[PDB]
Design a protein around this ligand. Structure first.
Ligand SMILES: CN1CN([C@@H]2O[C@H](COP(=O)(O)OP(=O)(O)OP(=O)(O)OC[C@H]3O[C@@H](n4cnc5c(=O)[nH]c(N)nc54)[C@H](O)[C@@H]3O)[C@@H](O)[C@H]2O)c2nc(N)[nH]c(=O)c21
Lengths: 706, 149
């Protein structure tokens, strides 16, 4: 028979069916057995494949493998052997996340009487033993410990029952290791620094507390579905295999381990009093639920409608407040630092598919969550706040921008620079970009008027209002005529010669003021205007000062239209009017200092860095862009600190929070690349001479792979 | 090893639409559609601006250019546009997450396009607008009221 049919059978088992899961498992067990003489090879590969790609269905497949071992001991043996080869093969290729699933699969296979407990206990001893290796990354020790502890919810009970002394030994070693671990990375990964109402915990300290509780509860957990408990008679009489001694692949220069993590947490049972009791933060139930949901998304993130269906149809031993769990997991992904598992916009539309699926329940939970997120803004990290802003505004544009703003009137009386009032402004500005100025003015209460974005109107220095005394006034009005008359590049140069020279700044000013003003109708006009007179630009801004002056004038022309500012910079860089370096220096200039804490400023800087990243060959220019950025960050941050030392004022000001966290963001958003420049940075910029406040960001960043 | 089930990417699949003006063999049209970085966007409001389209579509990646659909006669916005990305991957995410969501309060529809060519920015309807709007029956305020002819 076609191998395609075999794959379909194995992939579909466990899904929606009229017959019971047990019945279907036994059924498939038969089919798989009969096709062994001719397709054993294919079957081995398929079972190994779902074991590492379909973790959310773990116990479904271990049970199947269990039933098969009972029927054909030798087959079971070759499956385990294949699994171990795959595990090594996966570790070898730095696919540690995939490896963990293989490890949980082997673990659960013990409950299926396919692997003798003693073999697993030994393999785990060699795992924890890695924490004793010398001269290796903490992230290497972490992974082996994590792979061990995260297997306990499945096989913890059985292992403790067969080798409690051995396990007590492994635990002791694990605890002493977790006690000496470095926690430098934590401040950089927390979504909130506040430990109230929910502390954002380091993933290993949290998982350990969960395991401790499980142990105290005599290894009894009430969530995991275990199909195999229904085949006790069949499985409790199968011959169990013994695993060979497992030696973890030594650390090498090529080894890349997962970064450490911090557990996102915003809910507890009190947030849903009349629903099923929500498992606590330190219960393995909360861990397994979120792990499964995260995996569901990983498997279906490309098909939003299907993804929402799978999340909502998530099965469990006991009922839990699923909607709260789903919503929490999605925000845990959107707000994950350094970055989310998938593209940001996906979470926005996924939430909408979930709303269409559960119209009577999901929407309330989401609104509730939105309220809680807003009320906890004061200590939320800047990178997460941005995503919050971008999500919420985009979300609103899909529901006619309807929202009970009066619910956040508390922000009206606060300091404008405060997280809450700033969040509202940034959101309203975002809403205008997806709509229009009047639309936003009409959707908010009169009390929020001030928080609304100013009308994105262009500003022409030589318009009606202006006096004729202004330098270049005549040349400007002259250029206006020339432009309306389709003048050429040569004609424009000639008109500009009538300008005195204080690199000529005035030439640039009059040229950019007038050109932009006449193309203010749309982005396409401005774009075509930049292209047509591309020659005048390259000549007038051949020098760095020139490029810098172009940006300065362009900013004076469109300071009320942030979106226009951004698309103009992007186009000027792509067509070489200016380069990334200039844009970077422009970001930290005096003319932009009053807008330094606004979102558009950093959106432009990051779009600039990404363009430089996609530029092959120009690796020298790439490193220099980063050097420039960090250099300016250190200058302004230092300046602030020195002045606070003198004037005797507090360092923790709203301005400081932004700047320090924006520096942090540079690392987070480009951690992958900056890695190669890491060394040079430590030698020339982030030296021991730096103020600890600044050096700390650099060290927390390194902690991600230490 | 991999699984066919996990390859599912239905939102990125080609639709039924085929440009009846395309100068070439259908095979060559699909060949272009499969490597295209350009998307056709439909059901826009006549008051929907290019700036609004930039804000929405930039969520899936960097936009190279946007071309607004114009009434072949009065040369005004007639309800559709073309969004061209620098990379296929960003064009795919727009098909995955922007297609079928709101813009100017309307559910828009995106579709792969073989590529822009002069004259393609104009409605092919007899009255100048989009064919769809020629014999319409409903009263769509954001689309010029009744369906012309
Ligand atoms: C929907 N479009 C449009 N375009 C591109 O936009 C430009 C302007 O073209 P437009 O004025 O929309 O004219 P079209 O040629 O695009 O007209 P339409 O497809 O509406 O109708 C063409 C013919 O097909 C018949 N028809 C309608 N509905 C059906 C159906 O369900 N089945 C069949 N078999 N035929 C149907 C109509 O009666 C009519 O005779 C222009 O550049 C155009 O290419 C566009 N581009 C892409 N990539 N994708 C799209 O979906 C569109």
């Amino acid at each position: 028979e076609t191998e395609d049919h075999l794959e379909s059978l194995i992939c579909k088992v466990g899904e929606k069916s009229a017959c019971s899961l047990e019945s279907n498992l036994e059924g498939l067990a038969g089919v798989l057995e009969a096709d062994l003489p001719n397709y054993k090879s294919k079957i081995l590969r398929l079972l190994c494949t779902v074991a590492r790609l379909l973790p959310e269905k773990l116990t479904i497949y271990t049970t199947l493998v269990g039933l098969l071992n009972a029927r054909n001991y030798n087959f079971g043996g070759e499956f385990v052997e294949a699994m171990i080869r795959q595990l090594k093969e996966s570790l070898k290729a730095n696919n540690y996340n995939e490896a963990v699933y293989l490890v949980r699969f082997l673990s659960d296979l013990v409950n299926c009487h396919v692997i003798a407990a003693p073999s697993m206990v030994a393999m785990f001893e060699n795992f924890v033993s890695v924490t004793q290796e010398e001269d290796v990354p903490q992230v290497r020790r972490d992974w082996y410990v994590y792979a061990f502890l995260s297997s306990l919810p499945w096989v913890g009970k059985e292992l403790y029952e067969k080798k409690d002394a051995e396990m007590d030994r492994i635990f002791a070693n694990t605890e002493s290791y977790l006690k000496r671990r470095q926690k430098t990375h934590v401040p950089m990964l927390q979504v909130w620094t506040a430990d109230k109402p929910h502390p954002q915990e380091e993933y290993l300290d949290c998982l350990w507390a969960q395991i401790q509780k499980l142990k105290k509860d005599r290894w009894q957990e009430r969530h995991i579905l275990r199909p195999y408990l229904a085949f006790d008679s069949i499985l409790c009489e199968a011959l169990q295999h013994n695993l060979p001694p497992f030696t973890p692949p030594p650390h090498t220069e090529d080894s890349v381990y997962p970064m450490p993590r911090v557990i996102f947490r915003m809910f507890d049972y009190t947030d849903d009093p009349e629903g099923p009791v929500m498992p606590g933060s330190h219960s393995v139930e909360r861990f397994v639920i979120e792990e499964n949901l995260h995996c569901i998304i990983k498997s279906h993130w490309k098909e939003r409608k299907t993804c929402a269906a799978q999340l909502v149809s998530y099965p469990g031993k006991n009922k839990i407040p699923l909607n709260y769990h789903i919503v929490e997991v999605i925000f845990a992904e959107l707000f994950q630092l350094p970055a989310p598992p998938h593209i940001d916009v996906m979470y926005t539309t996924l939430l909408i598919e979930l709303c269409k699926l559960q119209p009577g329940s999901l929407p309330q939970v989401l609104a509730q969550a939105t309220e809680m997120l807003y009320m906890r803004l004061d200590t939320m990290n800047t990178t997460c706040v941005d995503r919050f802003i971008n999500w919420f505004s985009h979300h609103l544009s899909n529901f006619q921008f309807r929202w009970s703003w009066e619910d956040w009137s508390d922000c009206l009386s606060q300091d404008p620079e405060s997280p809450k009032p700033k969040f509202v402004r940034e959101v309203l500005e975002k809403c205008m970009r997806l709509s229009y100025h009047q639309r936003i003015l009409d959707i908010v209460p009169p009390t929020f008027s001030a928080l609304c974005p100013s009308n994105p109107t262009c500003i022409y220095k030589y318009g009606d209002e202006s006096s004729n005394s202004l330098p270049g006034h005549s040349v400007a009005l002259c250029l206006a005529v020339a432009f309306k008359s389709k003048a050429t590049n040569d004609e424009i140069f000639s008109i500009l010669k009538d300008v005195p020279n204080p690199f000529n700044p005035l030439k640039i000013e009059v040229f950019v003021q007038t050109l932009l003003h006449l193309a203010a109708k749309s982005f396409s006009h401005s774009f075509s205007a930049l292209a047509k007179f591309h020659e005048v630009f390259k000549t007038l801004a051949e020098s760095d000062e020139g490029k810098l002056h172009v940006l300065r004038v362009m900013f004076e022309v469109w300071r009320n239209h942030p979106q226009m500012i951004a698309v103009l910079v992007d186009k000027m860089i792509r067509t070489q009017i200016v380069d990334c370096a200039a844009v970077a220096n422009w970001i930290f200039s005096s003319e932009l200092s009053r807008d330094f804490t606004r979102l558009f400023v950093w959106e432009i800087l990051h779009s600039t860095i990404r363009k430089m990243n996609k530029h092959v060959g120009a690796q020298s220019e790439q490193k220099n862009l980063f050097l420039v950025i960090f250099q300016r960050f250190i200058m302004i941050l230092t300046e602030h600190l020195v002045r606070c030392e003198t004037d005797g004022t507090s360092v923790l000001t709203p301005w400081y929070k932004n700047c320090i966290e924006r520096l942090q963001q540079i690392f987070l958003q480009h951690h992958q690349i900056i890695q190669q420049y890491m060394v040079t940075l430590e030698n020339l910029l982030f030296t021991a001479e730096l103020d600890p406040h600044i050096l700390a960001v650099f060290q927390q960043f390194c902690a991600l792979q230490a | 090893g991999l699984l066919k089930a996990l390859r599912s990417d239905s939102y990125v699949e080609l639709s039924q639409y085929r440009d009846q003006h395309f100068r070439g063999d259908n095979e060559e049209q699909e060949k272009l559609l499969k490597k295209s970085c350009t998307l056709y966007v439909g059901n826009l409001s006549f008051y929907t601006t290019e700036e609004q389209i930039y804000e929405l579509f930039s969520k899936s990646g960097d936009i190279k250019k946007i071309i607004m659909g114009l009434d072949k006669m009065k040369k005004t916005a007639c309800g559709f546009c073309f969004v061209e990305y620098y990379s296929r991957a960003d064009a795919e995410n727009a098909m995955r997450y922007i297609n079928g969501t709101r813009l100017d309060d309307r559910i828009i529809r995106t579709d792969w396009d073989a590529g822009f060519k002069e004259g393609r920015q104009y409605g092919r309807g007899r009255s100048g607008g989009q064919v769809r709007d020629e014999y319409r029956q409903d009263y769509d305020a954001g689309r010029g009221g009744y369906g012309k002819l």
